[PDB]
Design a protein around this ligand. Structure first.
Ligand SMILES: CC1(C)[C@@H](O[C@@H]2O[C@H](C(=O)O)[C@@H](O)[C@H](O)[C@H]2O)CC[C@]2(C)[C@H]3C(=O)C=C4[C@@H]5C[C@@](C)(C(=O)O)CC[C@]5(C)CC[C@@]4(C)[C@]3(C)CC[C@@H]12
Ligand SMILES: O=c1ccn([C@@H]2O[C@H](COP(=O)(O)OP(=O)(O)O)[C@@H](O)[C@H]2O)c(=O)[nH]1
Length: 490
């Protein structure tokens, strides 16, 4: 009959809200969904779950207490930027302890299939023990995963010396040039511990039923097909997930949480405000914040700056509080010190462009809101996402960042105010080339909205997947009938 699914999200904020939204999409289309999580993580999205159950979807959370770990204080259950760095491996250790409780819950709930974050590679074995399909949720774009596979297969970085020599990523449908410094540490040379984790994750994916991406075909459908052939797997684009289940203002306001900025926006003319955000994980050093502050002030344009994680005192916070005073004196700038209501802001007509670290969720949300991008990749797969934005679909301009760094370090590179200002001036300056870029993102904005409406590309992929899973459930029911009839004869 009715499919039953258990969803297992990860415990970093961006991954959590992406996989929770995928859970909400499945429940919107008839699946009886249970989301397993811990209290501090549930706090970020239980409100969204309550709104959904009122549209009488069958979706609920199942709260599991976070384990005791020596030296880990109570209440620390998330991997985000506000988390003190020495607690991260302990938090990850506590998550690992939960695996057996998760598996017991699978055996107790007996779902027809499970949908789990990529950071749970063992879940493919759990599903095989239960005899059910496991879907894996992958972060980021098909493009970025195609680029990673090109690096792994062809090693173009091995044939160059220096750090400024560009190389093509072979086999991709588009010509894409990068330097060795723009590759992740775990891909560049000898394996590190993350290289081995990624190997285990990709092996798990190859054994899984299929993968789910927050993507849509009009944006990067060529890479969706490329990726399926690179992996030899099934995959479905089911995005933009943020738009699909957060079309209401109340949902946009509460997403991932736990009005003054909206009144400020209401006072501005259309497309006049630059939105600046570097995602849920980034922490900039003071010297970088100084360059951004000067670039924003010197641009002459209105802006909202989501400052992200700031070191206290002379590590940045003192400077930003002084800068915030300055820019309120002119009514040109607005700083957001905590979690911003990103979906509500991007949809506001006053917003005209976005400075982004190329986190895939912000790229997708900006496309839906029809906003051109200034690209400032930092870590993870963001340098690959920049290539797609800048070189393939041409909806952004780069600030000019040269070097990948890990998420927990400041690196050696400081992007200077002049280079930031060049990107702002292009986006906000009204020149003809920027206007052609705005038209390109507008076309894609219309495509996003169509993709999740009835018989859009993402709607259809989800419908086809659910039909396959219904088919598998029914096959097992009819096989039991066949076995019982055979035992009757004898
Ligand atoms: C933010 C995302 C989710 C990710 O972001 C995702 O990055 C993917 C990528 O890396 O390609 C993209 O595919 C995807 O789209 C994007 O969402 C970027 C990488 C990372 C920041 C990641 C990390 O750095 C290192 C560790 C260590 C691993 C390990 C083995 C150790 O080494 O000690 C054990 C201890 C330890 C602290 C566990 C925690 C992780 C897994 C940690 C902090 C979790 C958050 C994670
Ligand atoms: O102040 C903030 C920062 C981030 N986000 C949301 O958090 C996600 C950030 O994910 P992204 O892929 O852009 O970057 P990451 O956080 O993974 O580095 C997006 O859904 C944003 O809408 C938000 O609502 N408010």
């Amino acid at each position: 009959t009715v499919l039953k699914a258990v969803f297992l999200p990860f415990i970093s904020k961006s991954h959590l809200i992406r996989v929770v939204d995928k859970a909400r999409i499945f429940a919107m289309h008839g699946v009886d969904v249970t989301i397993i999580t811990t209290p501090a993580n549930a706090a970020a999205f239980q409100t969204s779950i309550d709104h959904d159950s009122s549209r009488s979807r069958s979706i609920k959370t199942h709260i599991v207490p976070f384990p005791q770990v020596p030296g880990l204080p109570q209440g620390f259950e998330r991997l985000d930027a506000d988390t003190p760095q020495h607690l991260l491996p302990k938090i990850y250790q506590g998550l690992s302890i939960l695996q057996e409780q998760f598996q017991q819950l699978f055996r107790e709930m007996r779902p027809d299939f499970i949908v789990t974050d990529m950071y749970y590679p063992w879940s493919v074995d759990a599903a095989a023990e239960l005899g059910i399909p496991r879907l894996v949720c992958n972060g980021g774009s098909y493009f970025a995963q195609s680029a990673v596979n090109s690096i792994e297969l062809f090693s173009p970085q091995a044939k160059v010396d220096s750090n400024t020599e560009t190389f093509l990523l072979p086999g991709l449908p588009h010509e894409v040039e990068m330097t060795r410094l723009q590759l992740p540490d775990w891909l560049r040379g000898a394996p590190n511990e993350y290289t081995y984790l990624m190997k285990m994750i990709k092996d798990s994916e190859r054994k899984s039923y299929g993968s789910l991406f927050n993507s849509f075909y009009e944006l990067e459908g060529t890479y969706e097909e490329h990726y399926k052939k690179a992996m030899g797997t099934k995959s479905w684009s089911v995005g933009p997930v943020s738009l699909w289940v957060n079309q209401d203002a109340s949902d946009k306001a509460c997403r991932g949480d736990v009005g003054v900025v909206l009144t400020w926006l209401d006072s501005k003319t259309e497309d006049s405000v630059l939105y600046v955000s570097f995602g849920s994980m980034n922490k900039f050093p003071k010297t970088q914040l100084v360059e951004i502050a000067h670039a924003l002030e010197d641009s002459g344009h209105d802006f909202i700056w989501v400052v992200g994680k700031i070191e206290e005192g002379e590590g940045g916070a003192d400077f930003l509080r002084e800068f915030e005073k300055k820019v309120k004196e002119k009514n040109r700038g607005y700083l957001i010190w905590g979690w911003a209501p990103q979906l509500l802001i991007l949809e506001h007509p006053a917003v005209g462009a976005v400075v982004t670290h190329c986190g895939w969720n912000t790229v997708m949300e900006s496309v839906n809101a029809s906003l051109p991008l200034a690209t400032w990749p930092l870590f993870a797969e963001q340098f690959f996402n920049e290539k797609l934005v800048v070189d393939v679909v041409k909806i952004g301009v780069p600030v000019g960042v040269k070097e990948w760094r890990n998420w927990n370090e400041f690196g050696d590179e400081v992007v200077k105010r002049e280079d930031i200002g060049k990107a702002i001036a292009f986006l906000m300056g009204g020149g003809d080339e920027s206007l052609e870029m705005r038209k390109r993102v507008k076309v894609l904005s219309g495509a996003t909205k169509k993709a999740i409406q009835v018989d859009g590309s993402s709607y259809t992929k989800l419908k086809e997947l659910i039909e396959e899973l219904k088919s598998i459930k029914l096959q097992k029911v009819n096989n039991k009938l066949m076995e019982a009839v055979a035992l009757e004869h004898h």
